[PDB]
Amino acid sequence: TTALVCDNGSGLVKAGFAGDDAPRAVFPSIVGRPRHQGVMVGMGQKDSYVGDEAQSKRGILTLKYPIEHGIITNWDDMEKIWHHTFYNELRVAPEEHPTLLTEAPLNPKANREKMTQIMFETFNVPAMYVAIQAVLSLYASGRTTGIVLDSGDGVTHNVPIYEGYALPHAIMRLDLAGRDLTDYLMKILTERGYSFVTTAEREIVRDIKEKLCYVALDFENEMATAASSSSLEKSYELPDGQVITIGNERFRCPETLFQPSFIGMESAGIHETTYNSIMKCDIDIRKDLYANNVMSGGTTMYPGIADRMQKEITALAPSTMKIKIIAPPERKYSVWIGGSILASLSTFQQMWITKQEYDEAGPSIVHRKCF
Amino acid sequence: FNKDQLEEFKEAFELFDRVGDGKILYSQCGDVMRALGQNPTNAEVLKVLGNPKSDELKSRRVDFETFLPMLQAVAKYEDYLEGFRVFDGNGKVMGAELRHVLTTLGEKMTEEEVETVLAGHEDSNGCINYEAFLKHILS
Amino acid sequence: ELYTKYARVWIPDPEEVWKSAELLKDYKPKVLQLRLEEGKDLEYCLDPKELPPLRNPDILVGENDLTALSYLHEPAVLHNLKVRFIDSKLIYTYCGIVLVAINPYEQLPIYGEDIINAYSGQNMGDMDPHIFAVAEEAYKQMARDERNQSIIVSGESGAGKTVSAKYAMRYFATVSGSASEANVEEKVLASNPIMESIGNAKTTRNDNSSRFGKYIEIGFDKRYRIIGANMRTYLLEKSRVVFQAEEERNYHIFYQLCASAALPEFKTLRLGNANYFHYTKQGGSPVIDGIDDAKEMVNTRQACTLLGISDSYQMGIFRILAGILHLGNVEFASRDSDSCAIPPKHDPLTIFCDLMGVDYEEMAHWLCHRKLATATETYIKPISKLHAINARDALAKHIYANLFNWIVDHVNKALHSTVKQHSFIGVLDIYGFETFEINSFEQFCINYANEKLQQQFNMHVFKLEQEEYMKEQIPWTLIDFYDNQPCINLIEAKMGVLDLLDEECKMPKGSDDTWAQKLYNTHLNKCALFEKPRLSNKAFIIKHFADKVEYQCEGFLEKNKDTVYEEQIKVLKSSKKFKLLPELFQDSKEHKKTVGHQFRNSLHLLMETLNATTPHYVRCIKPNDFKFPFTFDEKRAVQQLRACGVLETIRISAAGFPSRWTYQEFFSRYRVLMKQKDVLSDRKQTCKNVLEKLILDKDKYQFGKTKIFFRAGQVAYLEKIRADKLRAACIRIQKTIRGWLMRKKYMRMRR
Ligand SMILES: C/C1=C\[C@H](C)C[C@H](C)OC(=O)C[C@H](c2ccc(O)cc2)NC(=O)[C@@H](Cc2c(Br)[nH]c3ccccc23)N(C)C(=O)[C@H](C)NC(=O)[C@@H](C)C1
Ligand SMILES: Nc1ncnc2c1ncn2[C@@H]1O[C@H](COP(=O)(O)OP(=O)(O)O)[C@@H](O)[C@H]1O
Ligand SMILES: [Mg+2]
């Protein structure tokens, strides 16, 4: 039978069957509960809402994410999201389909233990695996050498890989995110005198970010030009048809990814953590990790981020050794595409954790097999 | 062999001497043995002759005294009947089949020899009473 | 032992694969002393271990059943065909149930009506072998029992399959009473040159090798009289459309079409000389010796017109083939490392558009880019030149396979007749086993298909003989199946060669080197039938039923890739200019499936079509390489007999009880051994004493109720001891008569 392939971050869940080329079900990983007194009788009140309901209803609701930074923070909502995914959205009984689950590297180990334990106990899935989100992007990009820069909501990490070997001593992990880009965008918009205080408002600001941000080819030139001209300034409509102008702040928000000092991290941007990750590994390898840079996950999709890095590293790195940046349009789904590829290899079928080997060994076996 | 036997055999041997030297050829040895009552095969004849080569078989001459040990060596019924019953079960044998086996297997004889010995022994069907033919040729 | 002086043995020679000799000496447990027609007296030499194959006695040689022979081995099967074919000129022969047919090049008289009528009453043993005995047994089974009947014909394409089918069709037409009702025969034989033209290609071993299975149903009314016919086709060599090894050609119809370019009709096609195009050029060898391409054309088209194809459909088909040829010449220039483009005003695509109707711009864009659709949104993604090439070649293969299935189904429209069919007899022509100095994906698929047919053949023979032992009340456990699941599980099953090849197609940066290097872990030590050639890492060896066969990987990955992008066929399907192109692609994963997986499905349908049925077999062996009206050349015939599984049917049956005798004929010769002391009232009881006394080991034979079953070799043993007892009697009589006639010469001489 086809395996299921499932990817969940703190943003969208992505799910589908292995061997398919695009995910069948995509919905925000949100669980929502009603915040107002139900007044109507026979309203049909519902214990909780999941994904697209929690979007549509949202104004009546309050909206909560069960994952902070790849770490599942409360399990009962995660279990609800999986239940909604398999029964309602895929509509396929999980007893019959091996399942593939995806995670950021250097997570708390218990997260893998519990994520396994729920699959075997609560869905009786016949077999399971876990993969690193960064590894699966190379399959989607068609390479066995490169440094996978991957950033969605939640975690941002670099994993270098050379000829199918990963290099644990060079893995980098950070907590800039589409989320802390959103919360910074909310904070800074207050200077234009617009305010958003609620989760459902945050889900507005996220659409403002998704439509209107772009990454400055040079920061200080456009910081001058926005002082110089209205021509940069772009306007947008709230759900109710009130309309707002936004300024330099639309480029200025993803500038934080290059300078985390703005949010108030002392860290260096994804460019310098890319460079330091390369520098952490052997000079024999390094030219190949300059030759392939693979961008994954949604936050990479800000227009012009690729050109900004291709400038920034070329300025940083040794002058003659050429740099290239590889940023396939699919990349928002590349981690799922990679899991589709991986779960349909015939060599891989050996390597699913079986129910037997769990039942002997308890959840801990996952630490032996998966990584 | 006693003196009388040796005398009869020597006389017969000398009758086969076509050169007057008191000798026969090796190739005549079998013929002399047969005239004297032996029935050796060509293989047996050549063996008692010492497997002679063609040239000495046809031209080397031996007197009676050298021939004699060979005659001795060669000298030293129900099977015969079953052997004829092989080619039958009404007690007959095709003349064509007997001719074929005598002219094509074993130590092949000539067709004229077979015609000569078979003359008058086959009936109108071309069948030979083999018990009678055998008794006749053993008499 | 069986060896004794004045015994005969087969000795190897280069000039013909064996030579007959006689022993001058007894053997003993070394050297043997041998008699030969030339250099008549020789040392022979004994391997430090075997003996030379002992030779069958001359009562058995020349019989109609090759398994009636007592010693079964390559020499005897060579000899017994040789004798009839040159000396008798009797060509049909039986091996077990399988019918061996040796191609004459002279047309023999024997096929005429009078013999057909004479066969029509007579069962499988009642006659000498002939094609009508198979066609009759099939017709009798169908009439005697509902179950549909198959005939299966195997060999190299030039071994006369078509003629062996054609006469079987005459047999059905003539016997069925059905001549008035329909001509299938005229239609089948007028259809043949079309499917030869599109179906066949030169293969380096011979011209006009058919690359596909061709299957024909002949349908009957419930009154067992012919309605009509239906074709099917299987196992087409989809890979050959775009790639050839050296000294091979693409399918004939491309060369025929290019040679026809002189004609005004095809002017618009702008076809160049046949080696201008990239699909035709690669074999290097654009002319088949001995044929006029353009003159084959006029018969091809006459066969189409006679088979009810539109005069304008013919130009449609040629317009499409010309489309494929123009398509191949498209050449991609890379924009970047990871993206590529078609250059401005590129000629062949400009012509391919004016042939097919589709816009230049949308083709040129879609060839350069894949489309991906998520549920909500869509991404036009660029693709590397090395991907774009395999896309174009996949589209070329997909067009050709559809055009072939359309031409076959229009053939069927002519052949098919509207009475509802009660049942059918089906006649199948397929390539036999195939091995060349180099072997490649085409041969790996051919050999897999062969060995899967061979499994059904084995199981069917094992059923028929477990019947024959059951009827005659032997214990049937005495004989055991012979099974090549251990090899099919290597080719077919998961973690098998085809599966690791599909995996290496999709895995990133896959290559032939990493495919072989991934095979050698899993199989090489673990599996008894997979073996590595010692001096190389680009190659692997598989033992089939027939032989060991070495496959080069070098080409082997590229040929497996198929994927066809949905946009690129959707563009064609939309095309305005003429009917047929939309007609081809009429009603997925089918675009994703690899060539080896499409073939693995096609063969599995062929197997379901045969396993519905109780087959009959014909094997065709081409007895000399040069088309001589009659010659027999043993070095060729060996290779045929191995490639057509006859030698394996024999090697299997030699472990059986192949040699099988009536109690009356057993008296008929062997009363000579039987002492008339013992010769007794009851035949079934009499021999039980004699045989168990002559043969001291009881395991070597069995008493069937109505027949006796000997192991191989002990019939000729009984014949030897009979010949000895006959010789002993011949001695005793010749001894007597020699002595008598010498005494009478002495009477003549004295008196
Ligand atoms: C007071 C401290 C720790 C905690 C409050 C002490 C408690 C006791 O630790 C837990 O066990 C709780 C929990 C946790 C959650 C789930 C789980 O299955 C196990 C543990 N883990 C967390 O809250 C992590 C989550 C995390 C961030 Br984001 N990135 C990370 C990168 C790698 C690993 C984990 C993380 N977290 C926010 C922190 O550590 C913060 C930054 N730590 C501190 O300020 C220092 C001064 C120590
Ligand atoms: N087209 C886009 N442009 C800019 N940001 C986007 C775009 N699409 C999604 N995002 C942001 O990226 C994050 C989602 O990233 P993603 O990798 O899909 O999450 P996950 O890691 O859960 O799959 C969210 O913060 C979302 O607002
Ligand atoms: Mg992600």
PDB file of N, CA and C in Angstrom, chain B residues 12 15-16 31 34-35 39-42 44 83-84 86-87 98 101-102 105-109 113 116-117 136-137, chain C residues 671-672 674-677 725-727 729-743 745-746 749-750:
ATOM      1  N   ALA B  12      45.701 -85.553 -44.007  1.00  0.00           N
ATOM      2  CA  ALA B  12      44.785 -84.492 -44.407  1.00  0.00           C
ATOM      3  C   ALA B  12      45.533 -83.181 -44.612  1.00  0.00           C
ATOM      4  N   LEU B  15      47.312 -83.169 -47.833  1.00  0.00           N
ATOM      5  CA  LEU B  15      46.392 -82.933 -48.943  1.00  0.00           C
ATOM      6  C   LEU B  15      46.140 -81.445 -49.161  1.00  0.00           C
ATOM      7  N   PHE B  16      46.218 -80.633 -48.104  1.00  0.00           N
ATOM      8  CA  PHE B  16      46.017 -79.196 -48.242  1.00  0.00           C
ATOM      9  C   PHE B  16      47.298 -78.476 -48.631  1.00  0.00           C
ATOM     10  N   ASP B  31      41.014 -73.866 -42.369  1.00  0.00           N
ATOM     11  CA  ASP B  31      40.392 -74.813 -43.287  1.00  0.00           C
ATOM     12  C   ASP B  31      40.785 -76.241 -42.940  1.00  0.00           C
ATOM     13  N   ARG B  34      38.998 -77.349 -39.779  1.00  0.00           N
ATOM     14  CA  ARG B  34      37.604 -77.652 -40.066  1.00  0.00           C
ATOM     15  C   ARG B  34      37.474 -78.985 -40.788  1.00  0.00           C
ATOM     16  N   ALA B  35      38.378 -79.268 -41.730  1.00  0.00           N
ATOM     17  CA  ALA B  35      38.369 -80.585 -42.359  1.00  0.00           C
ATOM     18  C   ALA B  35      38.632 -81.681 -41.334  1.00  0.00           C
ATOM     19  N   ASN B  39      35.749 -76.367 -35.281  1.00  0.00           N
ATOM     20  CA  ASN B  39      34.940 -75.245 -35.762  1.00  0.00           C
ATOM     21  C   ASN B  39      35.356 -73.921 -35.121  1.00  0.00           C
ATOM     22  N   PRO B  40      36.584 -73.466 -35.338  1.00  0.00           N
ATOM     23  CA  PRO B  40      37.004 -72.201 -34.724  1.00  0.00           C
ATOM     24  C   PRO B  40      36.519 -70.977 -35.496  1.00  0.00           C
ATOM     25  N   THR B  41      36.279 -69.888 -34.761  1.00  0.00           N
ATOM     26  CA  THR B  41      35.957 -68.606 -35.386  1.00  0.00           C
ATOM     27  C   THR B  41      37.220 -67.995 -35.985  1.00  0.00           C
ATOM     28  N   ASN B  42      37.049 -67.019 -36.889  1.00  0.00           N
ATOM     29  CA  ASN B  42      38.243 -66.349 -37.400  1.00  0.00           C
ATOM     30  C   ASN B  42      39.029 -65.704 -36.272  1.00  0.00           C
ATOM     31  N   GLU B  44      39.192 -66.782 -33.133  1.00  0.00           N
ATOM     32  CA  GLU B  44      39.846 -67.913 -32.488  1.00  0.00           C
ATOM     33  C   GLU B  44      40.990 -68.452 -33.336  1.00  0.00           C
ATOM     34  N   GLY B  83      19.621 -70.883 -30.262  1.00  0.00           N
ATOM     35  CA  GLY B  83      20.219 -69.983 -31.232  1.00  0.00           C
ATOM     36  C   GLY B  83      19.507 -69.976 -32.567  1.00  0.00           C
ATOM     37  N   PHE B  84      19.084 -71.152 -33.039  1.00  0.00           N
ATOM     38  CA  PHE B  84      18.277 -71.148 -34.259  1.00  0.00           C
ATOM     39  C   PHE B  84      16.851 -70.666 -34.004  1.00  0.00           C
ATOM     40  N   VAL B  86      16.038 -68.327 -32.181  1.00  0.00           N
ATOM     41  CA  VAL B  86      16.129 -66.869 -32.198  1.00  0.00           C
ATOM     42  C   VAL B  86      15.506 -66.298 -33.465  1.00  0.00           C
ATOM     43  N   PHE B  87      15.721 -66.948 -34.604  1.00  0.00           N
ATOM     44  CA  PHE B  87      15.328 -66.391 -35.890  1.00  0.00           C
ATOM     45  C   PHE B  87      13.989 -66.927 -36.373  1.00  0.00           C
ATOM     46  N   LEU B  98      17.731 -65.135 -42.899  1.00  0.00           N
ATOM     47  CA  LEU B  98      18.943 -65.904 -42.638  1.00  0.00           C
ATOM     48  C   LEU B  98      20.088 -65.440 -43.533  1.00  0.00           C
ATOM     49  N   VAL B 101      21.409 -62.064 -42.164  1.00  0.00           N
ATOM     50  CA  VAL B 101      22.193 -62.102 -40.934  1.00  0.00           C
ATOM     51  C   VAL B 101      23.530 -62.792 -41.181  1.00  0.00           C
ATOM     52  N   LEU B 102      23.550 -63.832 -42.026  1.00  0.00           N
ATOM     53  CA  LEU B 102      24.806 -64.523 -42.300  1.00  0.00           C
ATOM     54  C   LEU B 102      25.756 -63.696 -43.164  1.00  0.00           C
ATOM     55  N   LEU B 105      26.225 -59.696 -40.438  1.00  0.00           N
ATOM     56  CA  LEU B 105      26.725 -59.617 -39.077  1.00  0.00           C
ATOM     57  C   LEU B 105      27.853 -60.615 -38.851  1.00  0.00           C
ATOM     58  N   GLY B 106      28.579 -60.389 -37.762  1.00  0.00           N
ATOM     59  CA  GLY B 106      29.612 -61.303 -37.309  1.00  0.00           C
ATOM     60  C   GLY B 106      30.772 -61.405 -38.278  1.00  0.00           C
ATOM     61  N   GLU B 107      31.251 -62.634 -38.472  1.00  0.00           N
ATOM     62  CA  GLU B 107      32.340 -62.917 -39.405  1.00  0.00           C
ATOM     63  C   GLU B 107      31.756 -63.265 -40.771  1.00  0.00           C
ATOM     64  N   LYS B 108      31.421 -62.212 -41.517  1.00  0.00           N
ATOM     65  CA  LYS B 108      30.579 -62.310 -42.704  1.00  0.00           C
ATOM     66  C   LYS B 108      31.118 -63.311 -43.719  1.00  0.00           C
ATOM     67  N   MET B 109      30.228 -64.152 -44.231  1.00  0.00           N
ATOM     68  CA  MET B 109      30.553 -65.105 -45.280  1.00  0.00           C
ATOM     69  C   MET B 109      30.107 -64.533 -46.621  1.00  0.00           C
ATOM     70  N   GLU B 113      28.696 -68.850 -50.785  1.00  0.00           N
ATOM     71  CA  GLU B 113      28.779 -69.881 -49.758  1.00  0.00           C
ATOM     72  C   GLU B 113      27.414 -70.111 -49.122  1.00  0.00           C
ATOM     73  N   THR B 116      25.121 -71.897 -51.427  1.00  0.00           N
ATOM     74  CA  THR B 116      25.524 -73.284 -51.615  1.00  0.00           C
ATOM     75  C   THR B 116      25.048 -74.138 -50.449  1.00  0.00           C
ATOM     76  N   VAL B 117      25.294 -73.675 -49.221  1.00  0.00           N
ATOM     77  CA  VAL B 117      24.890 -74.456 -48.057  1.00  0.00           C
ATOM     78  C   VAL B 117      23.373 -74.466 -47.899  1.00  0.00           C
ATOM     79  N   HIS B 136      21.539 -81.749 -39.949  1.00  0.00           N
ATOM     80  CA  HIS B 136      22.227 -82.021 -41.206  1.00  0.00           C
ATOM     81  C   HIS B 136      23.640 -81.459 -41.193  1.00  0.00           C
ATOM     82  N   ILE B 137      23.787 -80.193 -40.792  1.00  0.00           N
ATOM     83  CA  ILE B 137      25.109 -79.570 -40.801  1.00  0.00           C
ATOM     84  C   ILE B 137      25.986 -80.028 -39.647  1.00  0.00           C
TER      85      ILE B 137
ATOM     86  N   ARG C 671      11.173 -60.849 -26.920  1.00  0.00           N
ATOM     87  CA  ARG C 671      11.049 -62.303 -26.869  1.00  0.00           C
ATOM     88  C   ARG C 671      12.349 -63.006 -27.240  1.00  0.00           C
ATOM     89  N   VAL C 672      13.162 -62.388 -28.101  1.00  0.00           N
ATOM     90  CA  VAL C 672      14.487 -62.922 -28.410  1.00  0.00           C
ATOM     91  C   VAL C 672      15.324 -63.097 -27.146  1.00  0.00           C
ATOM     92  N   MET C 674      13.850 -63.256 -24.118  1.00  0.00           N
ATOM     93  CA  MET C 674      13.055 -64.101 -23.239  1.00  0.00           C
ATOM     94  C   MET C 674      13.272 -65.571 -23.572  1.00  0.00           C
ATOM     95  N   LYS C 675      13.716 -66.336 -22.582  1.00  0.00           N
ATOM     96  CA  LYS C 675      13.720 -67.787 -22.694  1.00  0.00           C
ATOM     97  C   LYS C 675      12.299 -68.310 -22.849  1.00  0.00           C
ATOM     98  N   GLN C 676      12.050 -69.048 -23.935  1.00  0.00           N
ATOM     99  CA  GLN C 676      10.738 -69.660 -24.122  1.00  0.00           C
ATOM    100  C   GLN C 676      10.426 -70.674 -23.030  1.00  0.00           C
ATOM    101  N   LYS C 677      11.424 -71.031 -22.220  1.00  0.00           N
ATOM    102  CA  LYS C 677      11.183 -71.650 -20.923  1.00  0.00           C
ATOM    103  C   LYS C 677      10.201 -70.828 -20.096  1.00  0.00           C
ATOM    104  N   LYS C 725      23.332 -60.998 -27.857  1.00  0.00           N
ATOM    105  CA  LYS C 725      22.860 -62.380 -27.939  1.00  0.00           C
ATOM    106  C   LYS C 725      22.581 -62.798 -29.383  1.00  0.00           C
ATOM    107  N   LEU C 726      22.135 -61.847 -30.205  1.00  0.00           N
ATOM    108  CA  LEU C 726      22.040 -62.063 -31.645  1.00  0.00           C
ATOM    109  C   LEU C 726      23.407 -62.298 -32.270  1.00  0.00           C
ATOM    110  N   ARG C 727      24.407 -61.516 -31.868  1.00  0.00           N
ATOM    111  CA  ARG C 727      25.754 -61.700 -32.390  1.00  0.00           C
ATOM    112  C   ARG C 727      26.293 -63.079 -32.033  1.00  0.00           C
ATOM    113  N   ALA C 729      24.576 -65.836 -31.460  1.00  0.00           N
ATOM    114  CA  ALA C 729      23.957 -66.817 -32.353  1.00  0.00           C
ATOM    115  C   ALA C 729      24.539 -66.749 -33.763  1.00  0.00           C
ATOM    116  N   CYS C 730      24.760 -65.536 -34.270  1.00  0.00           N
ATOM    117  CA  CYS C 730      25.346 -65.368 -35.595  1.00  0.00           C
ATOM    118  C   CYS C 730      26.726 -66.005 -35.670  1.00  0.00           C
ATOM    119  N   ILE C 731      27.499 -65.892 -34.590  1.00  0.00           N
ATOM    120  CA  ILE C 731      28.777 -66.592 -34.499  1.00  0.00           C
ATOM    121  C   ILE C 731      28.569 -68.094 -34.591  1.00  0.00           C
ATOM    122  N   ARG C 732      27.655 -68.643 -33.790  1.00  0.00           N
ATOM    123  CA  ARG C 732      27.555 -70.102 -33.724  1.00  0.00           C
ATOM    124  C   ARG C 732      27.137 -70.705 -35.067  1.00  0.00           C
ATOM    125  N   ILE C 733      26.196 -70.051 -35.751  1.00  0.00           N
ATOM    126  CA  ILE C 733      25.803 -70.497 -37.089  1.00  0.00           C
ATOM    127  C   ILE C 733      26.915 -70.282 -38.112  1.00  0.00           C
ATOM    128  N   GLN C 734      27.520 -69.093 -38.153  1.00  0.00           N
ATOM    129  CA  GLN C 734      28.548 -68.868 -39.161  1.00  0.00           C
ATOM    130  C   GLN C 734      29.738 -69.791 -38.940  1.00  0.00           C
ATOM    131  N   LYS C 735      30.055 -70.094 -37.681  1.00  0.00           N
ATOM    132  CA  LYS C 735      31.059 -71.098 -37.352  1.00  0.00           C
ATOM    133  C   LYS C 735      30.738 -72.450 -37.966  1.00  0.00           C
ATOM    134  N   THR C 736      29.505 -72.919 -37.759  1.00  0.00           N
ATOM    135  CA  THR C 736      29.135 -74.214 -38.315  1.00  0.00           C
ATOM    136  C   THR C 736      29.252 -74.199 -39.832  1.00  0.00           C
ATOM    137  N   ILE C 737      28.654 -73.192 -40.471  1.00  0.00           N
ATOM    138  CA  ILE C 737      28.510 -73.233 -41.919  1.00  0.00           C
ATOM    139  C   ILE C 737      29.852 -73.006 -42.606  1.00  0.00           C
ATOM    140  N   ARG C 738      30.717 -72.172 -42.023  1.00  0.00           N
ATOM    141  CA  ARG C 738      32.096 -72.060 -42.482  1.00  0.00           C
ATOM    142  C   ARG C 738      32.813 -73.403 -42.451  1.00  0.00           C
ATOM    143  N   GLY C 739      32.704 -74.134 -41.334  1.00  0.00           N
ATOM    144  CA  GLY C 739      33.365 -75.431 -41.276  1.00  0.00           C
ATOM    145  C   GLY C 739      32.818 -76.416 -42.294  1.00  0.00           C
ATOM    146  N   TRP C 740      31.494 -76.465 -42.431  1.00  0.00           N
ATOM    147  CA  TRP C 740      30.874 -77.338 -43.423  1.00  0.00           C
ATOM    148  C   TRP C 740      31.344 -77.016 -44.837  1.00  0.00           C
ATOM    149  N   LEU C 741      31.279 -75.745 -45.226  1.00  0.00           N
ATOM    150  CA  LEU C 741      31.621 -75.385 -46.596  1.00  0.00           C
ATOM    151  C   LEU C 741      33.108 -75.535 -46.895  1.00  0.00           C
ATOM    152  N   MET C 742      33.981 -75.364 -45.899  1.00  0.00           N
ATOM    153  CA  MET C 742      35.378 -75.736 -46.107  1.00  0.00           C
ATOM    154  C   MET C 742      35.564 -77.240 -46.282  1.00  0.00           C
ATOM    155  N   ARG C 743      34.831 -78.058 -45.522  1.00  0.00           N
ATOM    156  CA  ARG C 743      34.925 -79.499 -45.745  1.00  0.00           C
ATOM    157  C   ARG C 743      34.429 -79.889 -47.135  1.00  0.00           C
ATOM    158  N   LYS C 745      34.506 -77.875 -49.830  1.00  0.00           N
ATOM    159  CA  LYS C 745      35.603 -77.477 -50.709  1.00  0.00           C
ATOM    160  C   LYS C 745      36.717 -78.521 -50.742  1.00  0.00           C
ATOM    161  N   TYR C 746      37.004 -79.145 -49.598  1.00  0.00           N
ATOM    162  CA  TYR C 746      37.946 -80.265 -49.561  1.00  0.00           C
ATOM    163  C   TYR C 746      37.445 -81.498 -50.313  1.00  0.00           C
ATOM    164  N   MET C 749      37.922 -80.605 -53.973  1.00  0.00           N
ATOM    165  CA  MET C 749      39.321 -80.537 -54.377  1.00  0.00           C
ATOM    166  C   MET C 749      39.961 -81.917 -54.465  1.00  0.00           C
ATOM    167  N   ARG C 750      39.685 -82.818 -53.513  1.00  0.00           N
ATOM    168  CA  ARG C 750      40.288 -84.144 -53.645  1.00  0.00           C
ATOM    169  C   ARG C 750      39.688 -84.914 -54.815  1.00  0.00           C
TER     170      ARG C 750
END
